[PDB]
Design an enzyme around this catalytic site. Structure first.
Site, PDB file in Angstrom:
ATOM      1  N   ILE A   1     -40.608  19.236 -20.432  1.00  0.00           N
ATOM      2  CA  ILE A   1     -41.838  19.459 -21.018  1.00  0.00           C
ATOM      3  C   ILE A   1     -42.071  19.647 -19.854  1.00  0.00           C
ATOM      4  CG2 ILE A   1     -43.265  18.649 -22.691  1.00  0.00           C
ATOM      5  CD1 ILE A   1     -41.366  17.563 -24.745  1.00  0.00           C
ATOM      6  N   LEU A   2     -42.945  19.925 -19.634  1.00  0.00           N
ATOM      7  CA  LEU A   2     -44.478  20.130 -18.511  1.00  0.00           C
ATOM      8  C   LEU A   2     -45.121  19.737 -18.696  1.00  0.00           C
ATOM      9  CD1 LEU A   2     -43.338  24.192 -17.006  1.00  0.00           C
ATOM     10  CD2 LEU A   2     -42.933  22.200 -15.791  1.00  0.00           C
TER      11      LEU A   2
ATOM     12  N   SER B   1     -27.575  31.685 -14.918  1.00  0.00           N
ATOM     13  CA  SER B   1     -26.644  33.221 -15.569  1.00  0.00           C
ATOM     14  C   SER B   1     -28.619  33.952 -15.737  1.00  0.00           C
ATOM     15  CB  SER B   1     -26.135  33.293 -16.918  1.00  0.00           C
ATOM     16  OG  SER B   1     -27.272  33.512 -17.886  1.00  0.00           O
TER      17      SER B   1
ATOM     18  N   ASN C   1     -41.379  32.716 -18.939  1.00  0.00           N
ATOM     19  CA  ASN C   1     -40.258  31.789 -20.412  1.00  0.00           C
ATOM     20  C   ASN C   1     -39.411  32.917 -20.966  1.00  0.00           C
ATOM     21  OD1 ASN C   1     -38.476  30.006 -20.709  1.00  0.00           O
ATOM     22  ND2 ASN C   1     -38.771  30.271 -23.429  1.00  0.00           N
TER      23      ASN C   1
ATOM     24  N   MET D   1     -35.253  22.116 -18.616  1.00  0.00           N
ATOM     25  CA  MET D   1     -35.154  21.610 -19.869  1.00  0.00           C
ATOM     26  C   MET D   1     -35.816  20.886 -19.194  1.00  0.00           C
ATOM     27  SD  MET D   1     -32.977  23.090 -21.994  1.00  0.00           S
ATOM     28  CE  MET D   1     -33.481  24.039 -21.953  1.00  0.00           C
TER      29      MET D   1
ATOM     30  N   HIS E   1     -37.104  33.305 -24.190  1.00  0.00           N
ATOM     31  CA  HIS E   1     -36.380  32.342 -25.463  1.00  0.00           C
ATOM     32  C   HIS E   1     -35.913  33.445 -26.036  1.00  0.00           C
ATOM     33  CE1 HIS E   1     -36.956  28.753 -28.139  1.00  0.00           C
ATOM     34  NE2 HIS E   1     -36.870  30.119 -29.415  1.00  0.00           N
TER      35      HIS E   1
END
Lengths: 207, 209
Positions: free
Chosen positions: A87-88, A14, A102, A85, A104
């Site tokens: 953790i980089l 979205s 990002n 989704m 949030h």
């Protein structure tokens, strides 16, 4: 075709959609690719309806060499996480420093991490919102670029508050990227971020 | 002249002034019964006296809580309002006035708990700041939230400039909340959060720079 963006997704996309609508006029920004760690991510279809090339990568272990490969090959200047989704890994965050952002769904630094809306709802806050921020080493703690506030009404549920915050994310993310593309965002010596143009980095969204 | 309020202060009494001005009107439901400082130099003490409100100064370290409670009881206080009061409240005091103490904190809780919340906001680089009215329970700066008011942070702000905009919003927030309490409009839900039982709203957007 001046600022080239890569958008990383895992879900409905979205926020990707808002981003694709905003920059497909007149526009300075190009989304050069969309990447997913989920072959079932509905956002992939949104991307394809805008003519944007899509790529699915393995999730566990995350095939980060393929992500970097796709981003380099599409000349990406700025990476946008939009519901991604995972953790980089350290190297990747180090490598894209100052070039990954990002959104949030809280007013940071409150309610870092997953389930940010539920946390706020249970908390009984009377005002909530979203934050756009550079992705640094610590989750949800890098420097803040833009914030938008929304109210929590007496009759809300955790889910209805989420929708109001998601609505605000749709306005904040593209405005934010636009300011980056037109060279008006600046990291300062004290580690805070500031705008060099007329525009403001706060949004008050009422509903 | 029916909700009786005791106001606890330590400084210049800016929020006290906003409350006393708000409730001095001849048709007000709220009476400020006493004002108590833990500081013999708090200028808010002179504000209280200009309104004919009795004032009291108590010892600071340790906080003389029994002197405080005796003053409050003898002035028939229903609601204890901290307004820039700088002393940790000992758990016995918070028990003794169970559910009858509120506080105005100069941040959007649960962000920036503790002292100098405005400076914390300033260094954090948030683009939106504000104040929170809340009940004082045992856990510091985490009792149930009553009202919150949001304020922008400008590019050219300093810590003090931003403090001033928050204070301005506190002047609107503190009186509003007290009056909702005086109306008996404030109710705690089963989950512990607060609700207003009327047309009034518990959030405020103070858009001004």
């Amino acid at each position: 075709k001046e600022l080239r963006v890569g958008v990383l997704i895992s879900g409905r996309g979205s926020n990707l959609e808002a981003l694709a609508k905003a920059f497909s006029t007149e526009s300075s920004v190009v989304i050069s690719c969309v990447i997913s760690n989920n072959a079932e991510a509905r956002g992939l279809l949104i991307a394809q309806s805008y003519g944007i090339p899509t790529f699915v990568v393995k999730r566990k272990p995350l095939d980060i060499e393929h992500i970097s490969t796709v981003l380099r090959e599409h000349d990406v200047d700025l990476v946008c996480l939009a519901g991604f989704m995972s953790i980089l890994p350290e190297k990747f965050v180090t490598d894209w420093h100052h070039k990954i952002i990002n959104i949030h769904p809280s007013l940071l630094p409150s309610f870092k991490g997953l389930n940010a809306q539920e946390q706020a709802y249970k908390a009984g806050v009377k005002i909530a919102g979203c934050t756009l921020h550079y992705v640094y080493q610590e989750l949800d703690a890098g420097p803040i670029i833009m914030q938008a506030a929304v109210p929590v009404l007496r009759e809300d549920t955790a889910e209805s508050l989420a929708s109001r915050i998601l609505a605000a994310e749709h306005v904040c993310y593209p405005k934010g990227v636009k300011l980056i593309a037109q060279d008006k965002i600046k990291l300062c010596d004290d580690g805070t971020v500031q705008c060099t143009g007329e525009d403001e980095l706060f949004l008050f969204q009422e509903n």
